[PDB]
Design a protein around this motif. Sequence first.
Motif, PDB file in Angstrom:
ATOM      1  N   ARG A 240      -5.290   5.122 -13.186  1.00  0.00           N
ATOM      2  CA  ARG A 240      -4.639   3.821 -13.235  1.00  0.00           C
ATOM      3  C   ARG A 240      -4.181   3.395 -11.847  1.00  0.00           C
ATOM      4  N   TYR A 241      -3.551   4.305 -11.101  1.00  0.00           N
ATOM      5  CA  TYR A 241      -3.105   3.985  -9.751  1.00  0.00           C
ATOM      6  C   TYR A 241      -4.224   4.022  -8.718  1.00  0.00           C
ATOM      7  N   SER A 242      -5.456   4.356  -9.101  1.00  0.00           N
ATOM      8  CA  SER A 242      -6.570   4.153  -8.183  1.00  0.00           C
ATOM      9  C   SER A 242      -7.548   3.125  -8.719  1.00  0.00           C
ATOM     10  N   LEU A 243      -7.160   2.408  -9.769  1.00  0.00           N
ATOM     11  CA  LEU A 243      -7.773   1.119 -10.039  1.00  0.00           C
ATOM     12  C   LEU A 243      -7.068   0.031  -9.245  1.00  0.00           C
ATOM     13  N   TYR A 244      -5.778   0.230  -8.959  1.00  0.00           N
ATOM     14  CA  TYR A 244      -4.983  -0.759  -8.242  1.00  0.00           C
ATOM     15  C   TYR A 244      -5.388  -0.902  -6.781  1.00  0.00           C
ATOM     16  N   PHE A 245      -6.094   0.076  -6.204  1.00  0.00           N
ATOM     17  CA  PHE A 245      -6.580  -0.109  -4.841  1.00  0.00           C
ATOM     18  C   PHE A 245      -7.922  -0.821  -4.815  1.00  0.00           C
ATOM     19  N   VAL A 246      -8.369  -1.343  -5.954  1.00  0.00           N
ATOM     20  CA  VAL A 246      -9.442  -2.325  -5.938  1.00  0.00           C
ATOM     21  C   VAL A 246      -8.852  -3.714  -6.135  1.00  0.00           C
ATOM     22  N   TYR A 247      -7.789  -3.818  -6.941  1.00  0.00           N
ATOM     23  CA  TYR A 247      -7.059  -5.074  -7.082  1.00  0.00           C
ATOM     24  C   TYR A 247      -6.348  -5.454  -5.794  1.00  0.00           C
ATOM     25  N   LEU A 248      -5.973  -4.469  -4.982  1.00  0.00           N
ATOM     26  CA  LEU A 248      -5.371  -4.767  -3.691  1.00  0.00           C
ATOM     27  C   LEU A 248      -6.445  -5.090  -2.665  1.00  0.00           C
ATOM     28  N   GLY A 249      -7.669  -4.622  -2.898  1.00  0.00           N
ATOM     29  CA  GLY A 249      -8.753  -4.944  -1.995  1.00  0.00           C
ATOM     30  C   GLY A 249      -9.253  -6.362  -2.155  1.00  0.00           C
ATOM     31  N   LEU A 250      -9.049  -6.955  -3.324  1.00  0.00           N
ATOM     32  CA  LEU A 250      -9.431  -8.340  -3.554  1.00  0.00           C
ATOM     33  C   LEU A 250      -8.305  -9.309  -3.241  1.00  0.00           C
TER      34      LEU A 250
ATOM     35  N   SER B  27     -12.554   2.175  -0.809  1.00  0.00           N
ATOM     36  CA  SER B  27     -13.099   3.514  -0.677  1.00  0.00           C
ATOM     37  C   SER B  27     -12.034   4.567  -0.439  1.00  0.00           C
ATOM     38  N   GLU B  28     -10.760   4.187  -0.431  1.00  0.00           N
ATOM     39  CA  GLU B  28      -9.686   5.153  -0.590  1.00  0.00           C
ATOM     40  C   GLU B  28      -9.293   5.297  -2.049  1.00  0.00           C
ATOM     41  N   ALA B  29      -9.990   4.596  -2.943  1.00  0.00           N
ATOM     42  CA  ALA B  29      -9.806   4.784  -4.372  1.00  0.00           C
ATOM     43  C   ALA B  29     -11.044   5.364  -5.026  1.00  0.00           C
ATOM     44  N   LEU B  30     -12.030   5.768  -4.235  1.00  0.00           N
ATOM     45  CA  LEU B  30     -13.084   6.650  -4.709  1.00  0.00           C
ATOM     46  C   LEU B  30     -12.769   8.103  -4.409  1.00  0.00           C
ATOM     47  N   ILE B  31     -12.253   8.375  -3.208  1.00  0.00           N
ATOM     48  CA  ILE B  31     -11.903   9.731  -2.805  1.00  0.00           C
ATOM     49  C   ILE B  31     -10.782  10.285  -3.672  1.00  0.00           C
ATOM     50  N   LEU B  32      -9.696   9.525  -3.824  1.00  0.00           N
ATOM     51  CA  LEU B  32      -8.548   9.996  -4.590  1.00  0.00           C
ATOM     52  C   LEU B  32      -8.838  10.072  -6.078  1.00  0.00           C
ATOM     53  N   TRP B  33      -9.754   9.245  -6.578  1.00  0.00           N
ATOM     54  CA  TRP B  33     -10.233   9.438  -7.940  1.00  0.00           C
ATOM     55  C   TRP B  33     -11.065  10.704  -8.046  1.00  0.00           C
ATOM     56  N   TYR B  34     -11.877  10.985  -7.030  1.00  0.00           N
ATOM     57  CA  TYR B  34     -12.730  12.163  -7.057  1.00  0.00           C
ATOM     58  C   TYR B  34     -11.936  13.439  -6.827  1.00  0.00           C
TER      59      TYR B  34
ATOM     60  N   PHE C  22       0.824  -1.208   0.000  1.00  0.00           N
ATOM     61  CA  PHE C  22       0.000   0.000   0.000  1.00  0.00           C
ATOM     62  C   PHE C  22       0.858   1.259   0.000  1.00  0.00           C
ATOM     63  N   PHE C  23       2.037   1.195   0.617  1.00  0.00           N
ATOM     64  CA  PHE C  23       2.969   2.310   0.592  1.00  0.00           C
ATOM     65  C   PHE C  23       3.828   2.330  -0.662  1.00  0.00           C
ATOM     66  N   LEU C  24       3.707   1.331  -1.532  1.00  0.00           N
ATOM     67  CA  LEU C  24       4.399   1.398  -2.810  1.00  0.00           C
ATOM     68  C   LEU C  24       3.516   1.998  -3.893  1.00  0.00           C
ATOM     69  N   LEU C  25       2.196   1.845  -3.788  1.00  0.00           N
ATOM     70  CA  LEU C  25       1.320   2.458  -4.780  1.00  0.00           C
ATOM     71  C   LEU C  25       1.034   3.911  -4.440  1.00  0.00           C
ATOM     72  N   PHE C  26       0.984   4.238  -3.151  1.00  0.00           N
ATOM     73  CA  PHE C  26       0.632   5.590  -2.754  1.00  0.00           C
ATOM     74  C   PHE C  26       1.779   6.560  -2.994  1.00  0.00           C
ATOM     75  N   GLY C  27       3.017   6.067  -3.032  1.00  0.00           N
ATOM     76  CA  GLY C  27       4.126   6.912  -3.447  1.00  0.00           C
ATOM     77  C   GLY C  27       4.326   6.893  -4.950  1.00  0.00           C
ATOM     78  N   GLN C  28       3.490   6.134  -5.661  1.00  0.00           N
ATOM     79  CA  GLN C  28       3.480   6.189  -7.116  1.00  0.00           C
ATOM     80  C   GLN C  28       2.250   6.904  -7.655  1.00  0.00           C
ATOM     81  N   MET C  29       1.228   7.109  -6.825  1.00  0.00           N
ATOM     82  CA  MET C  29       0.127   7.979  -7.223  1.00  0.00           C
ATOM     83  C   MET C  29       0.569   9.432  -7.248  1.00  0.00           C
TER      84      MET C  29
END
Length: 1217
Positions: A65-75, A893-900, A38-45
């Motif tokens: 693209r980097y806030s589609l990955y927080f749904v792949y990490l959720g699964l 739902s941390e990839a809805l806020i950051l997308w928004y 989670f700290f590798l994608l958030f420093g790449q967003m």
Amino acid sequence: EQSLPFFKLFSFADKFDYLLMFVGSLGAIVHGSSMPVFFLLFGQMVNGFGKNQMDLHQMVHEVSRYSLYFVYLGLVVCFSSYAEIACWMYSGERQVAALRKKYLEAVLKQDVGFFDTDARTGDIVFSVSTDTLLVQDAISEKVGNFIHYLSTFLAGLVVGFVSAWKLALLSVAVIPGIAFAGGLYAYTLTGITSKSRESYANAGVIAEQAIAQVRTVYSYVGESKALNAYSDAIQYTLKLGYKAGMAKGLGLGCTYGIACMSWALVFWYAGVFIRNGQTDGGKAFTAIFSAIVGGMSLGQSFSNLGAFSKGKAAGYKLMEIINQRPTIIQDPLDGKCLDQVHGNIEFKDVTFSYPSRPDVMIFRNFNIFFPSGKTVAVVGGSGSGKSTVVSLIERFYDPNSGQILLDGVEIKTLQLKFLREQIGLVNQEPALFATTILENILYGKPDATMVEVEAAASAANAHSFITLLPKGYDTQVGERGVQLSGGQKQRIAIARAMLKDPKILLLDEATSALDASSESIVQEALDRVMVGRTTVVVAHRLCTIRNVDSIAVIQQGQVVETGTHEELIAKSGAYASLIRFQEMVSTRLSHSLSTKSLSLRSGSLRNLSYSYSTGADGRIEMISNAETDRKTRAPENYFYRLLKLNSPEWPYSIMGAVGSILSGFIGPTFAIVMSNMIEVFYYTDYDSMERKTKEYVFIYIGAGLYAVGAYLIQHYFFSIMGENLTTRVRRMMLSAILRNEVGWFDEDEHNSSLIAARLATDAADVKSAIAERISVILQNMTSLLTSFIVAFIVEWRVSLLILGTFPLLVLANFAQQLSLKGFAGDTAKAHAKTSMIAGEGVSNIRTVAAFNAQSKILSLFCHELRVPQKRSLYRSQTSGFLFGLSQLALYGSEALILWYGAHLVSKGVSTFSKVIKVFVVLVITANSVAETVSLAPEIIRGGEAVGSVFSVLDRQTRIDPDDADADPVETIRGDIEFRHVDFAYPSRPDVMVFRDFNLRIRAGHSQALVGASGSGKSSVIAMIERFYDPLAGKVMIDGKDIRRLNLKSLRLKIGLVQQEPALFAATIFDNIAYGKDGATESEVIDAARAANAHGFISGLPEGYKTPVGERGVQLSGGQKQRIAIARAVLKNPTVLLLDEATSALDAESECVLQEALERLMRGRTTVVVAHRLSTIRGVDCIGVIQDGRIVEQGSHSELVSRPEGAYSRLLQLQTHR
Ligand SMILES: CC(C)[C@H](C)[C@@H](O)[C@H](O)[C@@H](C)[C@H]1CC[C@H]2[C@@H]3COC(=O)[C@H]4C[C@H](O)[C@H](O)C[C@]4(C)[C@H]3CC[C@]12C
Ligand SMILES: Nc1ncnc2c1ncn2[C@@H]1O[C@H](COP(=O)(O)OP(=O)(O)NP(=O)(O)O)[C@@H](O)[C@H]1O
Ligand SMILES: Nc1ncnc2c1ncn2[C@@H]1O[C@H](COP(=O)(O)OP(=O)(O)NP(=O)(O)O)[C@@H](O)[C@H]1O
Ligand SMILES: [Mg+2]
Ligand SMILES: [Mg+2]
């Protein structure tokens, strides 16, 4: 001591459990390396969400693209927390259930005399109760956390060093500067608590000697100064409890005094490596936060080692009973099987001793013969091996030298299914297993028919009594549905002896229920079954032996004489003194298990042990010890009452709570500064990234000293309020225990061993119900508030979507703190019906050895363990799927806020460093909100069970020692006249020891109450004072009603001498002056020389100063009785009361009462009772009671005029020495 390796605890796994630990180990590794991903994608967003501030069409791509990955990490967290919970909690349950099956097999097949109650049957039953809950709690689920939080550390130092390794050493090496100061707190916390733990035990014997001797403390007026010695022994814990509140502020002030001087160090060098061109503003977000929450997460993996050292110890006791080799085993091939036996038992010089201790000798040169088809009567007077004869034919033991033959064939060449099936056993407290009254009778034979069961209970005095029960032979004897709990225990056990049809029959002394006409009914039932069967008789009382057609008597090791009842009465050979011996006249384990379970619950959790009691008369009652949830709920208005009892210190609570709101500002002071440096790392003017990072280091220092002076106020205060509440309550409780009647202390659940604990622990947990559940509210209800005001000044279009999503972000951080303790939950309550079935299988083993019941208990235990597996299958799947879904809503739902956020920047509405100052504040806020809602039931639901101590403060007394509408006492003359007056104990009102008792005493006289063989003889003096109330009638004293006067004014002029005297923990200057306050030195010295002891009291090195209560020199009972008489002679009473009961003088060459009797009765009204008929020459009257009624009265000159009366029986007891 001895302990197994940690491996071989898994040695009961089958071939199916090697797959629920391979799935359940790949689940706990992928889940463990998810916070450092989670700290590798958030420093790449952020490296696309803000380096491209000039290209608004590149932002919308590379955040979609980097806030589609927080749904792949959720699964992945969906299906890797479902595979470490639902595959370890169940796979640690098929291994313990299997353990109990191998174990119970072990106990049933052991030699039967292995259990002799000498900490043996209180140890086997405890080993199946607790040790199979310590093997379970160490291998089921805490292995699933030890794997989880380990691989976070070994993947928090790989993502760290790959991205930027020059910050992955600054971020790591600082961490021991936190734990060193974080361990200095927990070090000195013990160093002050142990000064409070030790200083209380000085007060733990003053509030103990004034309760265990409450008869004496009430008899004198010595309860008004039993608080002034308990007031001045808590004041050495109050002022020592103050400066422990100082060592919590500076222990939480010098932690954020280094923590807020440690982010400044790792954010300054981040501002250096970017200007020099080695890293960038996004890769220095990863290498800091990966190595911190990775490196701090060995404080959790090394928290499981405390529960691993309890596994290797308690597992070894279970694993050594299984392979303990017995001696008397069944040989199904190396055994014989006779036919048409005759039962000619003959012991041919058979010696035997107890294998526990071979010191005493039981059967030295023992030789008897048993006939065929007759009855014998082996009889002794005392424990000369009277029950050893039946304990040898059963092969409960082996004779160490000798041989036993049946009809010329020895029993040591036979199997234990042809022998024990042919012998029936009846003994004391007969075994009724908790089943119906149809299955107990079928232990003799499992399936014959229905009508022979009725024929068995027909000739058993039972069939009438078991058809006057409104069910068809279906009555629970264990559960108290229909009770056959009368004094006449209806002997249904003889039906087992009759249905089994035995050749040999070993009866025993089966009339020990205070036998009368009720137990003569079961006597003739026994007398009709001894037909055509080789049988013995064992007897204690010879009133039921007089029709027995052969009697053989042993005395010591050998038979003395044989024959029938014509020459036994002849020749006076050890029978004439024994019939003169006839004319001269369990429930402990439930206390023993409660002692061994006590003083061991400090380290183990309360959801792990049990709490034992007798319960019904069917089994040992095992309460799951999670009874705090559904028992003893507190009164509803307690949160207002406890504030009212703690009021005078409203200055010390206002001064504390202004030091509480200031402590809630430390949250956003961290989150608003740290959300500005992720802006400043993306400047392009490298001298403007210097002048605005000196401001962001002088605030971390400026808010690092702020936390010293805002945790010191909130914890030095809110503990002065928290230690003038466990002081005022501990002094109001002892002033409310010393007003109850004496009969409340006679109950076993109110002894002087638990009521000294309910002032120690249960009165010290009000500090953590009204002082530390306000400070963990106002700290968190001002940090939730001041972050939802900063969120609506910066940007309101994103801080509205976060507020609607905020009911989900707090549930996801609430599930991450139930998982620290494991989701199993009350593991003692489900495995609590199982252990009761193993509780009746050990403590009643002597009837399981007979009847061949060794394969019916195993199929009433492996038929009941199918309930705690299909409960651990439903719960492991539901509470493993509702956790794997409540972490999907976190990352999903941390990839809805950051997308928004990256949508509104495209329209020019709001900008970067306004999405981050709202998103970073409103995640660290939600981390603290799931610490407040976690304690939400504990506020409302009665506090807790130890905060529910109002059964002593709110409990109305019966006999009030002080009233206002009660006339005082001027002068007693002494006019004891008992009117129509009956009495029984309120503890056991089943016996009615007094039946309209009556007396009369004129002033200036005496009383000569007889012992009457202990017919409640020490209870007449109990009603002169009010230790109890009579059931009906009045105690007429001084011509007046006793219950119309002030009681504390009455007892100061009626002095008694207790039956069994004991002194207080003081010198012998209080002990002879405790009955007279106000006297100082003068008449105290003359008061000793009455029961004289005067060279005995002058013979001492330290004058009069000697500890005689406890921890000093020990005195004898004949000398302690001398001291007690010096009490009453100093008080100068009106109504003296003496006592003697049941051989309690212990003073050979009796001279301690030759002086004390005749010199003391000069002008007083005395009531003197004596248990021995010696020095019984009363001088004014006499009273002789029979069964609650006096029968004869007068002086000791008309008693001797009657020929028999009732006293002529007593004079024959003088010659019975
Ligand atoms: C990096 C955030 C923006 C992120 C969204 C967030 O999820 C983050 O992972 C949170 C939950 C963690 C990451 C690092 C944690 C901090 C790192 O640990 C610490 O040193 C302590 C010091 C002290 O305990 C503070 O009260 C909390 C504080 C400072 C922690 C508070 C919670 C965090 C801030
Ligand atoms: N498990 C044991 N281990 C060691 N000693 C025992 C045990 N059980 C009983 N004893 C004692 O050894 C002696 C053997 O007597 P026992 O065979 O028990 O007859 P008894 O029932 O004690 N006599 P009574 O009770 O008067 O009918 C007794 O004094 C017992 O108290
Ligand atoms: N606190 C009590 N609660 C219930 N029963 C009691 C209590 N104390 C004694 N008893 C019972 O009362 C019966 C007779 O004893 P008690 O009434 O105490 O006087 P006592 O012992 O006969 N005096 P003495 O004859 O001088 O020894 C006994 O069987 C006791 O079990
Ligand atoms: Mg016996
Ligand atoms: Mg007595």
